[PDB]
Amino acid sequence: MKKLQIAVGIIRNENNEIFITRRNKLEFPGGKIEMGETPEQAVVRELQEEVGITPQHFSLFEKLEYEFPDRHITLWFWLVERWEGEPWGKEGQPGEWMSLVGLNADDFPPANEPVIAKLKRL
Ligand SMILES: [Mn+2]
Ligand SMILES: [Mn+2]
Ligand code: NA
């Protein structure tokens, strides 16, 4: 029984647009929390690696858990509202700003559904 945790960054600007990356299907920047890192350190590291920004002000937006045989997975969704730098496709992946109003849960993997609903509201 091992744990696998992933930190996810929801980057929102002043115009209520979120930075979305692509694979085909759309998704949020993010990745695995490594040994010895806190959830906060991991989201900062993964975002610096994937989109070239350093989160400065962020809060826990949602935490989802998945219990599978021999594996406990936790997804940490952080709402990033202020950062240093400009988001871009640093790891060579497609990226772009999309307004919250126009976000469609069907364009993201089913796992993000509850977060999108919550996001696409307030
Ligand atoms: Mn990554
Ligand atoms: Mn990684
Ligand atoms: Na990623």
Q: In angstroms, what is the span from residue 93 Cα to ligand 1's centroid? A: 11
Q: Write the DSSP symbol of residue 67.
A: E
Specify the amino acid at residue 19.
F
80: three-class secondary structure by DSSP: strand
The CATH number of whichever domain residue 76 belongs to comes to 3.90.79.10
Domain count, the chain: 1
- 52 alpha carbon – ligand 2 mean position (Å): 14
Dist. CA 36–CA 54, nearest whole Å: 19
Using left for φ > 0, alpha for ψ between -120 and 50, and beta otherwise, residue 16 falls in: left
**What does the buried/exposed string (b/e) look like for 65-98 if buried means 16 or more CB atoms within 10 Å of the residue's CB?**
eeeeeeeeebbbbbbbeebeeebeebeeeebeee
Task: Name the 3-class secondary structure at 99.
Answer: strand
Expressed as residue numbers, the domain containing 71 is 1-122
Q: What is the resolution of this structure in A?
A: 2.0
Which segments of the chain are extended strands (E)? 2-11, 17-22, 26-27, 30-32, 54-68, 71-84, 95-99
Instruction: Give, in degrees to the nearest 5, the angle at Cα 6 between 2 and 55.
Output: 145
SS3 of 43-58: the string is: HHHHHHHHHCCEEEEE
Annotated binding residue 9:
no
Side by side, the strands of the sheet bearing 2-11 are 30-32, 2-11, 71-84, 54-68
The answer to the question of whether 49 is labelled as a binding residue is: no
